[PDB]
Ligand binder design. Structure first.
Ligand SMILES: [K+]
Ligand SMILES: [K+]
Ligand SMILES: [K+]
Ligand SMILES: [K+]
Ligand SMILES: [K+]
Ligand SMILES: [K+]
Ligand SMILES: [K+]
Ligand SMILES: [K+]
Ligand SMILES: [K+]
Ligand SMILES: [K+]
Ligand SMILES: [K+]
Ligand SMILES: [Mg+2]
Ligand SMILES: [Mg+2]
Ligand SMILES: [Mg+2]
Ligand SMILES: [Mg+2]
Ligand SMILES: [Mg+2]
Ligand SMILES: [Mg+2]
Ligand SMILES: [Mg+2]
Ligand SMILES: [Mg+2]
Ligand SMILES: [Mg+2]
Ligand SMILES: [Mg+2]
Ligand SMILES: [Zn+2]
Lengths: 153, 60, 114, 96, 82, 127, 205
RNA sequence: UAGUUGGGCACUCUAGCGAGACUGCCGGUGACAAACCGGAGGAAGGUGGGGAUGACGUCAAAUCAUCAUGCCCCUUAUGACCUGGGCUACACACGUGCUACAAUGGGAAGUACAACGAGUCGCUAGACCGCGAGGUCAUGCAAAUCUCUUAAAGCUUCUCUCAGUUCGGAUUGCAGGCUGCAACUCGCCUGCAUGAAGCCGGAAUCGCUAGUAAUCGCGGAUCAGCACGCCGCGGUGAAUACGUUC
C-alpha cells in the first residue's frame, strides 16, 4: 500500500510434522476454506512419499522446495516509450510463496486421478530436480539471465 | 386515478385474492408494511418525525 | 442385448440399465429389486439366467421405440389440434411458459447474430 | 403471581418495575425479580430515496424490552395494590 | 396441477349455456369471455367463440381437444416474425 | 477440587473445568476426538498445557455451545488458559507471551446494505 | 449532499417518541387513529400556535397533550373550545378522548412555530430576507445557542427557484447530544410552494 | 429416557447499573511542542473492529407516477364501472445473477456443531397414509416456556474410476401436490421418463487487505400462492501488499 509495509500474519506449525511450511502448503491447496480436505490431502501425499521412497516426506518436500524456489525474478518497468523486464533478487518470503504456488498449480495440472497422488508425484520430481515446477524455475532464471543487462536499474 | 383506486381498494373485494394493501396515508400500493399500514416513503417520513412509537434509526 | 440396446458391459448393472431409453436410475433400482439381482455386480458378470430375468422385467416395462412413438403421438396431437403448446412445438419455442426475450436457446437452437 | 412488563424504552420500564417490586414488598408479599428477558428486535430496511436508487438504504429497529416479576405468598392487599399502581402509558403490563 | 379432489373446473354460465344447447339438432356458436373454463366431453362437437382480448375466435371442439382449457386454443398475441 | 474457566471464540462459549488427572479431555460428555475430529484443532486445544509444561497433569471437562467446531475449539482453549491462571498465577507470564489469554475479538462482520457481503460489492460495469 | 432528519437522528438518543403508547395487535390501528387525530387537530387549530401533539393510550382511553403558545385561544371561554374539540374527537376516534393543553413558553425556540411564522409572512409577500432576519433575532433573544433558517422556491416569483438561508450562533447537526429542534413548513404562494426549514439548537443535553 | 423432578444460581445466559483505554505509564527520537518508534500492563493500545452520522456546494442529475404544488390541457371524457388481454412477446445486442463443466468430485449410509429472526386462525408437535410434493387426526404456543428449527458445508465408512460419464441438469412427455373463484395466456412444487449446451471460457473487464475474499447454509420483509433478487445471521476460512513508475 501507500503508507508502507504491513505486518505478516503468522501460521502455527503443522500438528503432526511440527512445521509451519506444511501448514502453508495446506493453505495453498485449500479451496473455499475447506481446510479439512486440504489437510487430509497433504497428509495422504506425504504418506505416498514415505511409501514410494524410504525417506522422510518432510525432508523430501524441503528438497523439492530448494529445487523449485527461485533466486532471480523479473520485474516489469515502463521506461518512457519502452516497457521491458528487469532482473530482481527474490526476498525469502516471496521465495517460499513462489515455490508453493508453482508446486500446487502444476500438481493440479498433472494427469493422475487424485490430487494427493498428483501432489506427491510433483513433490518427488521437484526433490529429484525434475518436473514442471523445476522447469518453471528454470524458465524464470532463464528470463532473468536474458535480461541480465538491466541489473543496474 | 388515485382517488378512484383508493375508494375501490377500501370497498370489499369481489374475490379474496383481489384484496390488496395501499398506504393508508398516501395510497401507495407497493412496499406497504403490514405492521404499520404505510408505504416505505411515509414510514420513513413519520419515523423521522418520531410519531411511530418504538421505531428509531437502526445501527449495529 | 436386453431391450434391443447393447448396454455397457463394465459398468454396474443399475447404470447399464439406465443406458436403456425410457429407464432411469430409479426404474433400474426397481427392476433389480424385482429380479433379486444385486446392483453392484457388473453386467458382464451377470449370469445368463439373471440377464433373462432382467429381460422379462424390461419387457414388462415400456421402453425404446414404444416409448418414443407414444411421446411423438402426444406432440403430434397438440400440433394437429393447434393448441398453444402445439404452436410452441411447431415453432421450436418454450412450451412450459418460460420467457423468450432472453435465453430459450435450448428450444431456439444456436444464436443467429442477425 | 406472575407479571410481564414490556416497553420500547428500558428506562421507563425499569422505573415501573421498581414501583411494582416496592409496592409488593411494602405490602409484605415476597417478590422474585425483576428478571430481564431477551429484548425483542425487529428490523426494517427501506430505500432512502422515493424513486429508483436501490443501493442507498436506511434501517430502522423496534426494540421491546421485557421484565418479569413473580409475586410469592400474595396477601389479599397485594392484588388490589398491583392494580392501583398504575404504570406510564409506555409500558404494557400482563398479570398471570 | 388442479387437485383431483377439486375436480375439473368450468364457469357456471358456460356450463349452463352448453347444457341448454345439449338437446340441439344443430349447434350454435357459444360466445364466452371465459378462458379459464375447461373443455368437457359434453363440450365436444360445439363451436365456441372465445374472446382473445380483442375478439371472439371460433374453435370447433372435439374429443381430441377435451381435457384442456379453452383459453389455450385461442392465442392472445400475434408474432409474424421480423 | 476443580478449577473453572470461561472461554469464548466467535459465537462459541466454553465453560472449562480442570481436575487433576491423566490429561483426558471430555466435551459435552464426549471425548475430544469424537467431538472435534480435527487433529489440528485438538493440538490447538492442548497448546496451553504445552506452554505451561503441564502436559497430561490435568483432565478437562468442558460444557461448550454456540459457534462451530473451530470456534468452540478456540473457546475451549481460552477457557483452559483462564483455568490455568486459577491453578497457578505464575503461568500468567508464559500464557500471556503465547497470547493464549487474549480473547480473540474477530467476529463476523455485518453485511452492509447495498453490498452482497460485508465487503464484497456487486459487479460493476461502466457501460 | 442530503442530510439525516435532525429529529429522526436523535429520536431514542435524547428525543422521545411523540406517540407515547405500546401496542402489539392494535399497533396499526392506533397509529392510523393517531395520524387522523393529528390531521384533524392541524385543520381545526390551524390559526392557533399548536406545535407538538403527544398521544398516550390507556385501554380505550386516549390522552392527548397539545402544546400551544395560545392556550387561551385553544381553551376558549370556560373551556368551551376544548370541550367542543373533545366531542368532535370522540366522534372521530370512537372512544374517550381526554385533552391536556400545555403552554409553550418561549415560542421563539420552537422550530415549527418559527417556521410557521416565516411561511405566513411569505404568503403575505414579505421580503424573505426580512422574515428570516427577524426570526433569527427573536430566537437569539429567547436564548437559543444557535439558529439556522432556509427558504427555497420561486423566491419573489423568479422563474429560477433557489435557496436562501441564514444562521447565527452554533448549529452542530453532527453533535448527537445537542438538542436541535427542526421543522419543515410550506408557504403556498402565487407561483407555487416555498419550503421553509428551521433548525434551533438549544442547550445541549 | 430426558434439566427430568426435587434442589441451587454457582457457571453460562439474559439486561440494567457500573468498571475499562485516556498515548494513561515506561524507554528512545523530536524544535523543552505537536507528535512519531518501541515497551509494560491489560480482554482489548493508540480511532481496538463495525455501524449511524454525508460540510458549502457540483451535475437545469432523478422524481409532477409516493405525496404536495404554480401554470397549461380534458370535463357524457385524458374522468368512472366491468370482463378479458397486456405489462411474461422474441431473428437479435448488453448489464446483473444462479447452475455447471467434475475425483479438493458424484452417489449411499452414519455422526456433530450455529446465529439472526417469525408465529393466531398464525407457527404447528406427535402419530397415521403417501415414493414424494403433501394429506388426516391432533398437540403446545400471543411464545428465553411451544413451533418453524436435528442447518449446510463438516467428520467416518462404502461406491463410482477420468467417461460428455453414476458429471451436467436445460428442454420435453406423462402423472400429481398445493394456494386460490380461477394456474391456457401465466404460479411454485413432486414422481417417473428424457437427458440439451457445457471439457474453465478472445479482446476486455469486476470484487476484495482478515474473521475479509472464497465457500456453506439459516431467517426475514413483500406475500393466498410465487425470488437464482433484497435485507440480515451465523459456519469454515485463506493468498498477497516489494512499492507509488504507470
Ligand atoms: K401491497
Ligand atoms: K413468456
Ligand atoms: K441477458
Ligand atoms: K453485566
Ligand atoms: K403529482
Ligand atoms: K403538476
Ligand atoms: K444494457
Ligand atoms: K439471478
Ligand atoms: K466420496
Ligand atoms: K399462471
Ligand atoms: K412467501
Ligand atoms: Mg395480492
Ligand atoms: Mg435411460
Ligand atoms: Mg414465468
Ligand atoms: Mg433535467
Ligand atoms: Mg426524465
Ligand atoms: Mg398532476
Ligand atoms: Mg416488467
Ligand atoms: Mg473431463
Ligand atoms: Mg481498505
Ligand atoms: Mg458469512
Ligand atoms: Zn405512503
Amino acid at each position: 500500500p501507500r503508507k508502507g509495509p504491513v505486518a505478516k500474519r503468522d501460521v502455527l506449525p503443522d500438528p503432526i510434522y511440527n512445521s509451519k511450511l506444511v501448514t502453508r502448503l495446506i493453505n495453498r491447496v485449500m479451496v473455499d476454506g475447506k481446510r479439512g480436505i486440504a489437510a487430509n490431502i497433504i497428509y495422504n501425499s506425504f504418506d505416498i512419499i514415505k511409501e514410494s521412497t524410504g525417506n522422510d516426506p518432510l525432508e523430501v518436500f524441503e528438497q523439492a522446495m530448494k529445487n523449485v524456489m527461485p533466486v532471480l525474478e523479473v520485474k516489469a518497468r515502463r521506461v518512457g516509450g519502452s516497457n521491458y523486464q528487469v532482473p530482481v533478487e527474490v526476498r525469502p518470503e516471496r521465495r517460499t510463496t513462489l515455490g508453493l504456488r508453482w508446486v500446487v498449480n502444476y500438481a493440479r495440472l498433472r494427469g493422475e486421478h487424485t490430487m494427493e497422488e498428483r501432489l506427491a508425484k510433483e513433490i518427488m520430481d521437484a526433490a529429484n530436480n525434475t518436473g514442471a515446477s523445476v522447469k518453471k524455475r528454470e524458465d524464470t532464471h532463464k528470463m532473468a539471465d536474458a535480461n541480465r543487462a538491466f541489473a543496474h536499474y | 386515478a388515485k382517488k378512484s383506486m383508493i375508494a375501490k381498494n377500501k370497498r370489499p373485494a369481489k374475490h379474496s385474492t383481489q384484496a390488496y394493501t395501499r398506504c393508508e396515508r398516501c395510497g401507495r400500493p407497493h412496499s406497504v408494511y403490514r405492521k404499520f399500514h404505510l408505504c416505505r416513503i411515509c414510514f420513513r417520513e413519520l419515523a423521522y418525525k418520531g410519531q411511530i412509537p418504538g421505531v428509531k434509526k437502526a445501527s449495529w | 442385448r436386453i431391450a434391443g440396446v447393447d448396454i455397457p458391459r463394465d459398468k454396474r448393472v443399475v447404470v447399464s440399465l439406465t443406458y436403456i431409453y425410457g429407464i432411469g436410475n430409479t426404474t433400474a433400482k426397481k427392476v433389480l429389486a424385482n429380479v433379486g439381482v444385486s446392483e453392484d455386480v457388473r453386467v458382464r458378470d451377470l449370469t445368463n439366467e439373471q440377464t433373462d430375468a432382467i429381460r422379462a422385467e424390461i419387457d414388462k416395462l415400456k421402453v425404446e421405440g414404444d416409448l418414443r412413438r407414444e411421446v411423438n403421438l402426444n406432440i403430434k396431437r397438440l400440433m394437429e389440434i393447434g393448441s398453444y403448446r402445439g404452436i410452441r412445438h411447431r415453432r421450436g419455442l418454450p412450451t412450459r411458459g418460460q420467457n423468450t426475450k432472453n435465453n430459450a436457446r435450448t428450444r431456439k437452437g444456436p444464436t443467429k447474430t442477425v | 403471581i406472575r407479571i410481564r412488563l414490556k416497553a420500547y424504552e428500558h428506562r421507563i420500564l425499569d422505573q415501573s418495575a421498581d414501583k411494582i417490586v416496592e409496592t409488593a414488598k411494602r405490602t409484605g408479599a415476597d417478590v422474585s425479580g425483576p428478571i430481564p428477558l431477551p429484548t425483542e428486535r425487529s428490523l426494517y430496511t427501506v430505500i432512502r430515496a422515493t424513486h429508483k436508487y436501490k443501493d442507498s438504504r436506511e434501517q430502522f429497529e423496534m426494540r421491546t424490552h421485557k421484565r418479569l416479576i413473580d409475586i410469592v405468598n400474595p396477601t389479599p392487599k397485594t392484588v388490589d395494590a398491583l392494580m392501583k399502581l398504575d404504570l406510564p402509558s409506555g409500558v404494557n403490563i400482563e398479570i398471570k | 396441477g388442479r387437485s383431483l379432489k377439486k375436480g375439473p373446473f368450468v364457469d357456471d354460465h358456460l356450463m349452463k349455456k352448453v347444457e341448454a344447447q345439449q338437446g340441439a339438432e344443430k349447434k350454435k356458436v357459444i360466445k364466452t369471455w371465459s378462458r379459464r373454463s375447461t373443455i368437457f366431453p359434453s363440450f365436444v362437437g360445439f363451436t365456441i367463440a372465445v374472446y382473445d382480448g380483442r375478439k371472439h375466435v371460433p374453435v370447433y371442439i372435439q374429443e381430441d381437444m377435451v381435457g384442456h382449457k379453452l383459453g389455450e386454443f385461442a392465442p392472445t398475441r400475434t408474432y409474424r416474425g421480423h | 477440587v476443580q478449577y473453572s474457566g470461561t472461554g469464548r471464540r466467535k459465537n462459541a462459549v466454553a465453560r472449562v473445568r480442570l481436575v487433576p488427572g491423566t490429561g483426558k479431555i471430555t466435551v459435552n460428555k464426549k471425548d475430544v476426538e469424537e467431538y472435534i475430529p480435527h487433529a489440528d484443532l485438538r493440538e490447538v486445544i492442548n497448546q496451553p498445557f504445552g506452554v505451561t509444561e503441564t502436559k497430561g497433569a490435568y483432565d478437562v471437562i468442558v460444557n461448550v455451545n454456540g459457534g462451530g467446531y473451530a470456534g468452540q475449539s478456540g473457546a475451549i482453549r481460552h477457557g483452559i488458559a483462564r483455568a490455568l491462571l486459577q491453578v497457578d498465577p505464575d503461568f500468567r507470564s508464559a500464557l500471556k507471551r503465547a497470547g493464549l489469554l487474549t480473547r480473540d475479538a474477530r467476529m463476523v462482520e455485518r453485511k452492509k446494505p447495498g453490498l452482497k457481503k460485508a465487503r464484497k460489492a456487486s459487479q460493476f460495469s461502466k457501460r | 449532499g442530503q442530510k439525516v432528519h435532525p429529529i429522526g437522528m436523535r429520536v431514542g438518543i435524547i428525543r422521545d417518541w411523540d406517540a407515547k403508547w405500546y401496542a402489539e395487535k392494535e399497533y396499526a390501528e392506533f397509529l392510523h387513529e393517531d395520524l387522523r387525530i393529528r390531521k384533524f387537530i392541524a385543520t381545526k387549530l390551524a390559526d392557533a400556535a399548536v406545535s407538538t401533539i403527544e398521544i398516550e393510550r390507556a385501554a380505550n382511553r386516549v390522552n392527548i397533550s397539545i402544546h400551544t403558545a395560545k392556550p387561551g385561544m385553544v381553551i376558549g371561554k370556560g373551556g368551551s373550545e376544548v370541550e367542543n374539540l373533545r366531542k368532535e374527537l370522540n366522534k372521530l376516534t370512537g372512544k374517550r378522548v381526554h385533552i391536556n393543553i400545555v403552554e409553550i413558553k418561549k415560542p421563539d425556540l420552537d422550530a415549527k412555530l418559527v417556521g410557521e411564522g416565516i411561511a405566513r409572512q411569505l404568503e403575505n409577500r414579505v421580503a424573505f430576507r426580512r422574515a428570516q432576519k427577524q426570526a433569527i433575532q427573536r430566537a437569539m433573544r429567547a436564548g437559543a445557542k444557535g439558529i439556522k433558517t432556509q427558504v427555497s422556491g420561486r423566491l419573489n416569483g423568479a422563474d429560477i427557484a433557489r435557496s436562501e438561508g441564514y444562521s447565527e450562533g452554533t448549529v452542530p447537526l453532527h453533535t448527537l447530544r445537542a438538542d436541535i429542534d427542526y421543522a419543515w413548513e410550506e408557504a403556498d404562494t402565487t407561483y407555487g410552494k416555498l419550503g421553509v426549514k428551521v433548525w434551533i439548537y438549544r442547550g445541549e443535553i
